Amino acid sequence: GNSQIHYSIPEEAKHGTFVGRIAQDLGLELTELVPRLFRVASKDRGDLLEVNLQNGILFVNSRIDREELCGRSAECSIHLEVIVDRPLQVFHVEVEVRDINDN
């Protein structure tokens, strides 16, 4: 089974920063996501990151800076749900922050 997937991204990741090949980890061709009605959403704000069918790479689409993200909590975990139509299901996506409290 391939439902549990997580990525790694260091804090202060300006919009467009690498996070983790969502498609590569999913096991689907970038030319199949389009017709598969690929979609991304979250229960928090629904606007944390986005996937690019170009290279199936995951880039930042929100505030990652420790100031915005959290900063305080050394270890910050994020949850996301990728809505895909045909097949009808969701992909568990968890991205953690990489940095230190001291700086």
Side-chain angles (χ1 to χ4, degrees), residues 7-21:
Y7 316 139
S8 310
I9 171 173
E11 283 204 299
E12 228 178 54
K14 259 138 200 239
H15 294 202
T17 298
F18 165 60
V19 186
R21 307 124 216 289

Side-chain angles (χ1 to χ4, degrees), residues 7 35 58 78 88 97-99:
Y7 316 139
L58 221 300
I78 301 105
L88 234 147
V97 287
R98 227 266 180 72
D99 233 37

Side-chain angles (χ1 to χ4, degrees), residues 11 15 18 24 41 46 53 55 62 64 72 75 86-87 89 93:
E11 283 204 299
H15 294 202
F18 165 60
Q24 201 278 338
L53 317 109
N55 193 246
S62 208
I64 306 300
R72 263 208 234 195
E75 290 238 306
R86 215 135 270 177
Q89 53 181 82
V93 177

Side-chain angles (χ1 to χ4, degrees), residues 1-2 16 29 51 53 63 74 81 83 87 90-91 95 102:
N2 205 269
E29 222 123 323
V51 48
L53 317 109
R63 316 107 152 72
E81 264 99 48
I83 311 95
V90 192
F91 300 132
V95 293
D102 297 293

